[PDB]
């Protein structure tokens, strides 16, 4: 997260870290047994880390649970990142508490201009590299479809939306992928891609979760 702020320990209790020997992506807890992340975060041997603040220090509220299965969206296209969504099932149910909690799925899509909370442990610099250890947060509005498509001609589908600031300076970044965009208490986005980070006229691009609620609910119910 570039241009954000330190969330505070466990203030984003649905935020998870995906670990394969190291943190590589975020995710969002949607019930005690299931996490939703980006398809481009897929790999085998994922451990889901819940209750994290400093990802390099055991602080006492963590739960570490291996994934038992991953389900990449049937229409995911790794070339274009269309349908950049996956589900991860936990081998054992998380113990839900005030610091490990699920986030509700949308009942409808969110409007342009709605303010959202974007979070993660990704790079905090728009030129260069610095990774923060504690969770970072950014408040940012959903941008109009036309400004999104103007920023990325030929690359935006109906399964993507943009959020952030066209002036630059505030954005998600590498290492945030798979993590949450929460608006009005609902998981509306997944950190997906962008051009650089926090650059002018290049806002972040997010998977549009509201298009996937039926797929999520049916897939979980059958797996």
Ligand X SMILES: N=C(N)c1ccsc1
Residues annotated as catalytic are: 40, 84, 177
Beta bridge partners of 137: 5, 119
115 is in an annotated binding site: no
Interface pick for ligand X out of 172, 180, 188, 209 (rule CB under 6 A)? 172
Of 42, 50, 194, 212, the one binding ligand X (CB under 6 A) is 194
Cβ distance to Ca ion smaller for residue 61 or 157: 61
- Choice between 59 and 145, CB closer to Ca ion: 59
Q: Which of 27, 50, 171, 188 binds ligand X (CB under 6 A)?
A: 171
Interacting span for Ca ion (CB under 5 A) from 47-55, 76-84, 109-117, 151-159:
47-55
Looking only at residues 54 through 73 of this chain, which bind Ca ion when binding is defined by CB under 5 A?
54, 59
Rounded CA separation 183/180 (Å): 10
How wide is the angle at C-alpha 3 spanned by C-alphas 134 and 20, nearest 5°?
Answer: 40
Among 193, 207, 209, 216, binds ligand X (CB under 6 A): 193
Q: Is the CB of 90 or the CB of 187 nearer to ligand X?
A: 187
Q: Report the partner that residue 84 touches, choosing among ligand X, Ca ion, none (CB closer than 5 to 8 A by kind).
A: none
Closest contact distance (angstroms) between CB of 194 and ligand X is: 2
Residue nearest to ligand X (CB): 194
Per rule CB under 5 A, count of chain residues that contact Ca ion: 3
Q: Which stretch in 21-29, 62-70, 104-112, 165-173 sits in contact with ligand X by CB under 6 A?
A: 165-173
Q: What is the dihedral of CA 86, 91, 92, 95, to 10 degrees?
A: -40
Return the number of the residue (90 or 151) whose C-beta is nearest Ca ion.
90
193 binds, among Ca ion, ligand X, none (CB under 5 to 8 A by kind): ligand X
Q: DSSP assignment of the chain, as one string? A: -BS-EE--TTSSTTEEEEESSSEEEEEEEEETTEEEE-GGG--SS-EEEES-SSTTS--S--EEEEEEEEEE-TT-BTTTTBT--EEEEESS----BTTB---BPPSSPPPTT-EEEEEESS---SSS----SS-EEEEEEBPPHHHHHHHSTTT--TTEEEES-TT-S-B--TT-TT-EEEETTEEEEEEEE-SSSS-TT--EEEEEGGGGHHHHHHHHHT-
Q: Which residues carry a binding-site annotation? A: 52, 54, 57, 62, 171-172, 174-175, 177
Q: Which residues carry a binding-site annotation for substrate? A: 171-172, 174-175, 177
Which residues in this chain contact ligand X in the complex, by CB under 6 A?
A: 171-174, 176-177, 191, 193-194, 197, 204
């Amino acid at each position: 997260i570039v241009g954000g702020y330190t969330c505070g320990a466990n203030t984003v209790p649905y935020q998870v870290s995906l670990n394969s020997g190291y943190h590589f992506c975020g995710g969002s807890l949607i019930n005690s047994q299931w996490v939703v992340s980006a398809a481009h975060c897929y790999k085998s041997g994922i451990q889901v880390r819940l209750g994290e603040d400093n990802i390099n220090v055991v602080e006492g509220n963590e739960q570490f649970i291996s994934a038992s299965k991953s389900i990449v969206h049937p229409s995911y296209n790794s070339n274009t990142l269309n349908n950049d969504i996956m589900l991860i099932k936990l081998k054992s149910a998380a113990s839900l508490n005030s610091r490990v909690a699920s986030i509700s799925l949308p009942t409808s899509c969110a409007s342009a201009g709605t303010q959202c909370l974007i979070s993660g442990w990704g790079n905090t610099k728009s030129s260069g590299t610095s990774y923060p250890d504690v969770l970072k947060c950014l408040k940012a509005p959903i941008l109009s479809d036309s400004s999104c498509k103007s920023a990325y001609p030929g690359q935006i589908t109906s399964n993507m939306f943009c959020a952030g600031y066209l002036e630059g300076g505030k954005d998600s970044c590498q290492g945030d992928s798979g993590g949450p965009v929460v608006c009005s208490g609902k998981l509306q986005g997944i950190v997906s891609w962008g051009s650089g980070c926090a650059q002018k006229n290049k806002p972040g691009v997010y998977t549009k979760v509201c298009n996937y609620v039926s797929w999520i609910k049916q897939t979980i119910a059958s797996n």
